[PDB]
């Protein structure tokens, strides 16, 4: 429940609903996991 | 030379005009880089 947002290293990965979202953003280069 | 694909191993890129457009798609982790 609610909106959490976490940390890790250079990536910031957050809980939508029951979803795993992972953004990544270095820089140019921006990588999006979706699990 | 002109507008082809180039795949190496899992990394497909591909040249747009004199930009190196470089992505990455292994599942659920899809990485796009813009260079």
Known sequence: R???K???X???A???XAVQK????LXG???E???
């Open 10 to 12: 250079g990536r910031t």
């Open 2 to 4: 609610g909106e959490c």
């Open 29 to 31: 280069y921006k990588c």
């Open 22 to 25: 992972w953004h990544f953003v």
């Open 33 to 35: 996991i979706l699990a």
């Open 6 to 8: 976490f940390t890790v």
């Open 14 to 16: 957050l809980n939508t």
